[PDB]
Design a binder for this molecule. Structure first.
Ligand SMILES: OC[C@H](O)[C@H]1CCCN1c1ncnc2[nH]ccc12
Ligand SMILES: [Cl-]
Length: 167
């Protein structure tokens, strides 16, 4: 039993809700919140910009030190950093950005990072300003993640389209 509330159950391990991931993290304080990161951990917009803003830019300061030490992530890769005031940890995961011409096949590799964590609050990878089809992202999530994932979806038309179309 966990403290996530109001989610629709899609499968044995995947749950979905129309929600703002920032406000959800602040309420639940999950062990792991997933960020929709880029390889430079430059948290400008989308989920990343919103999470970072909620940390008063502490996420960005920590991220800049991470990059200075380790260099950029790989597309499809991840790193674990602090969750600041939002969660114990933040798993920064890089899905392919179709608006950069990156390979959508890397979306499965990106979701594989979730399997290293028993429970996660997450967005749909490569959706929104990353330019992939969210219905596709949900399908890859369900077919790749085996740990317990609570998916937040900010928009309502999306969310309703994702639910109604789920196979
Ligand atoms: O709503 C659309 C999608 O879900 C993803 C892609 C674009 C933003 N977005 C978010 N999901 C969840 N929480 C969020 N907070 C702020 C943004 C956000
Ligand atoms: Cl985004």
């Amino acid at each position: 039993v966990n403290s996530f509330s109001g989610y629709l159950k899609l499968t044995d391990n995947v749950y979905i809700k129309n929600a703002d991931i920032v406000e959800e993290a602040k309420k639940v304080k999950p062990t792991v919140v997933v960020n929709a990161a880029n390889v430079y951990l430059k948290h400008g917009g989308g989920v990343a910009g919103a999470l970072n803003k909620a940390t008063n830019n502490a996420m960005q300061v920590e991220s800049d030190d991470y990059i200075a030490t380790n260099g950029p992530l790989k597309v499809g890769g991840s790193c674990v950093l602090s969750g600041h005031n939002l969660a114990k940890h933040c798993l920064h995961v890089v899905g392919p950005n179709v608006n950069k011409g990156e390979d959508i096949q890397l979306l499965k590799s990106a979701y594989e990072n979730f399997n290293q964590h028993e429970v996660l609050l997450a967005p749909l990878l490569s959706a929104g300003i990353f330019g992939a089809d969210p219905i596709h992202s949900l399908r890859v999530c369900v077919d790749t993640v085996r740990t317990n994932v609570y998916l937040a979806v900010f928009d309502k038309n999306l969310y309703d389209k994702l639910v109604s179309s789920f196979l």
